[PDB]
Symmetry: D2
Subunit: 205 residues, 4 copies
């Protein structure tokens, strides 16, 4: 049994992406009889989704957790819902900047996360790690991937649960001095380990 965990390459002028750095130590790890496979996907509209679909079809996971950077957030956030819209504040890594276009034409307006998000947030908080449910994953490539994931799973393999977790800046990214919050890499990896284990052990909230 496989858990697929995805993250992104650096974007928006950054030299690092905490989502990828944080999941690297999880590769090959066992989660109660499931093993973790990681995959890096490009921060590019549509191309990102092609990488995602290819990874899902290759690994045939029972659980998919996609991870992204949410610079400025203070804590770990587990996303409640993905919406069917691209509205890019900045260009992606290939220079695309879609304004109010659908992620999937004629797809539904939204998909709820299929992860046990409350249980995950409570496990994190109980472990002394600040975490909360988020009601918006943005309208950039992270939400795009969350929506595409949930749509793909619903259309092909409905018993497979997918969802999204955002991590904050690493300290090295918050040095730029706009009074930005951070979380160490060590703490991020621990938080993701707990969140993934919790999602695996608990089918629903």
């Amino acid at each position: 049994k496989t858990i697929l965990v995805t993250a992104f390459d650096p974007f928006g002028g950054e030299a690092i992406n905490p989502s990828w750095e944080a999941i690297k130590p999880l590769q090959g790890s066992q989660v109660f009889g499931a093993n973790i496979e990681i995959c890096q996907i490009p921060c590019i509209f549509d191309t990102s989704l092609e990488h995602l679909y290819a990874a899902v079809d290759k690994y045939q996971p029972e659980l998919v957790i996609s991870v992204g950077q949410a610079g400025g957030r203070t804590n770990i956030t587990v996303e409640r819902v993905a919406i069917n819209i691209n509205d890019a504040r900045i260009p992606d890594n290939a220079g695309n900047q879609p304004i109010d276009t659908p992620v999937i034409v004629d797809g539904p307006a939204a998909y709820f996360s299929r992860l046990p998000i409350k249980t995950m947030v409570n496990a994190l908080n109980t472990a002394g790690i600040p975490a909360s449910v988020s009601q918006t994953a943005g309208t950039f490539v992270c939400n795009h991937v969350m929506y595409g994931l949930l749509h793909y799973l619903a259309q092909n393999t409905p018993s497979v649960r997918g969802g999204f977790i955002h991590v904050p800046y690493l300290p090295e990214q918050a040095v730029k001095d706009g009074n930005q919050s951070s979380m160490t890499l060590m703490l991020m990896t621990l938080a993701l380990k707990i969140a993934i284990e919790t999602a695996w052990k608990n089918t629903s909230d």
Copy 2:
């Protein structure tokens, strides 16, 4: 041959009902360090107006440090902050650990309005940033026991041992402290301790900005 010198690092007891103060937890691993020609000595100060200062004076007299760095917690701040200035006022929003809640009283009667930190604060902030640790200069240490101690420290050194440099550093909440409702930033204990190591070493090795 030459004498080892002494760096005194202080931190506080927990306050406002908390069970821990990360300022103390962060400096505990530094006790007994013999590094770059200096013995590091630490001391826990009660979070009580005036009594804190008596403990501070006793520690300075005991260790006869060539450098003093006092540490406190500033829950809500996003990074490590190095204080520019201590002001001669107490104005407590909550009571201290002895129940005192002074409103607009001097730290030292007829002392000057303020003391600038004598630490190389820009150099320290730059050393932290360069090491990948978020940090900034702060223009206010608050009006609670932390500012009280910063002021009392700088006044005591000025009056008694002017060549000794003192100052103050604030750490943010620990992650476990930020779990409560609210959008509060945090920094791990491990990162705090690393940041304090860098700050102390930089302060010791740089006489001015």
Copy 3:
């Protein structure tokens, strides 16, 4: 030919909630009562801050006034500006109880309704009209999970099922200065600025069919 009925814009706001004695959403739209713009008369309606009951009152108002445009207003304490909502989501998750003591946890607004409805208002044009008037405003991607989002969802669903040509959406106002006096560094906007902003937003929505 003669006595051609004017079109109608329905603007709703809420009762006070959360222990407040005032709701600026209602205070801000009161001056719009008995007004008209570009061939449409404005009708206002105050709805209870109660899950499900709020929706009952909304449906009754819509049926009564047969509006061609519906804009619902609520307070989002802590926001810095005027926000125009992009999307309503099919969930109730109450941080605090409503005015009747209900505190639903992760229940649908409408059972077996879609997961979301996008606002049908020209939200970018409304935001730009506010900004160019000198009034801070932004598009929001979340109306929360309390009664405001609940009403936005129910409105969009009701219109979709019954009168699909009718456009609806939601606008949040921040705290009034008096509400922000409590400790905690809260942002605010005066009632006068809120009323001006809603006037501009409503006029822009009525005159622009799309973004």
Copy 4:
């Protein structure tokens, strides 16, 4: 009996300064047996203080209140203390960007405001206007002026009380979509009116 109120001209890239806009309607109004006189001073280190020095020597005020813009603040703030340092994040209006230089060479490290700051904040809050005491007026031209003012009065006319009030952005300045707080001009002017009258009527705190 003249109450003196000062404000600044636009700085940074700004087109307007709320401090000046807010105090204009206050010109010539009486406050319990005193007149208000206003003066605009340039946002330039040292040059600012000369204009200030001239104005105090001209109207011979029993009360001086200087006002400035604190973009980002959510409320009206009354400054507790001025410090003897210039440390400019951006150049002033003449291109000067001093780094850690004294406001007055060999002046004391700081001067406390001589205004009844707690009474002023209480009066504002009671009027339904968010306000607080601030412990830092920055290290730009506003603090520079506050310090130079308090030094001047202490050296020449110790019975004359001086201090500083910061106003937030006007709404039109917060349009930039950087999530900035604001206060309308109407509210600022009322706040300043109340704060000034409170300062006048209450000699202590």
